[PDB]
Swiss-Prot record:
Function as written in the Swiss-Prot or TrEMBL entry: Chromatin reader protein that recognizes and binds acetylated histones and plays a key role in transmission of epigenetic memory across cell divisions and transcription regulation. Remains associated with acetylated chromatin throughout the entire cell cycle and provides epigenetic memory for postmitotic G1 gene transcription by preserving acetylated chromatin status and maintaining high-order chromatin structure. During interphase, plays a key role in regulating the transcription of signal-inducible genes by associating with the P-TEFb complex and recruiting it to promoters.
Domain of life: Eukaryota
Protein name as catalogued: Bromodomain-containing protein 4
Covalent link location (Glycyl lysine isopeptide (Lys-Gly) (interchain with G-Cter in SUMO2)): 58
Processing after translation: Phosphorylation by CK2 disrupt the intramolecular binding between the bromo domain 2 and the NPS region and promotes binding between the NPS and the BID regions, leading to activate the protein and promote binding to acetylated histones. In absence of phosphorylation, BRD4 does not localize to p53/TP53 target gene promoters, phosphorylation promoting recruitment to p53/TP53 target promoters.
Record-marked site positions (Acetylated histone binding): 99
Domain notes per entry: The NET domain mediates interaction with a number of chromatin proteins involved in transcription regulation (NSD3, JMJD6, CHD4, GLTSCR1 and ATAD5). The C-terminal (CTD) region mediates interaction and recruitment of CDK9 and CCNT1 subunits of the P-TEFb complex. It is also required for maintenance of higher-order chromatin structure.
Effect noted on mutating residue 104 to G: Found in a patient with a neurodevelopmental syndrome; uncertain significance
Domain Bromo stretches: 17-123
Expression (tissue specificity): Ubiquitously expressed.
Extra information: JQ1, a thieno-triazolo-1,4-diazepine derivative, and I-BET, a benzodiazepine derivative, have been tested on tumors with success. Treatment with GSK1210151A (I-BET151, a I-BET derivative) has strong effets on mixed lineage leukemia and promotes myeloid differentiation and leukemia stem-cell depletion.
């Protein structure tokens, strides 16, 4: 019935950083996924109410979406690339867990994940 509050994108008690890797994650990785024709279901938190996705937040207790990731990067929320990569992987995994294998939304996530891995293969060394 109700949706939970979306994930935080900034916190005044969590230290903030910019790194060249995090800049690549925003400017190259996130933007490359975001343009994809299959990105739109992943661009905002799941509205379980409007999507009619039964039990979404009964099953998924660590929701994540690319809009949240984008805003985290914009706000210097991540300390390191591993934290950001983990959020992408949580987003994909949530899709694989909630939906049935082979579902069209799963095909979309798999296409985005393949592309994500292409792009992170080229993550620069830290400056
Ligand atoms: C990712 C969060 N999220 C947002 N909407 C979500 C979810 C979720 O987890 N589960 C869901 O069923 N939902 C609803 C939902 C949202 C969207 C869709 C997919 N609609 S489509 O793009 O026109 C489409 C149609 C045919 C098709 C594909 C994609 C896959 C590739 C080509 C292919 O062979 N078949 C199907 C279900």
């Amino acid at each position: 019935s109700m949706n939970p509050p979306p994930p935080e994108t900034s916190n005044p008690n969590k230290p903030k950083r910019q790194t060249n890797q995090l800049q690549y994650l925003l400017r190259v990785v996130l933007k490359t996924l975001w343009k994809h024709q299959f990105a739109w279901p992943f661009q905002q938190p799941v509205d379980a109410v409007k999507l009619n996705l039964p039990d979404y937040y009964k099953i998924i207790k660590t929701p994540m979406d690319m809009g949240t990731i984008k805003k985290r990067l914009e706000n210097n929320y991540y300390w390191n690339a591993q934290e950001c990569i983990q959020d992408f992987n949580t987003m994909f995994t949530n899709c694989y867990i909630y939906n049935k294998p082979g579902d069209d939304i799963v095909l979309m996530a798999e296409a985005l994940e393949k592309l994500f891995l292409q792009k992170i293969n080229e993550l620069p060394t830290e400056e």
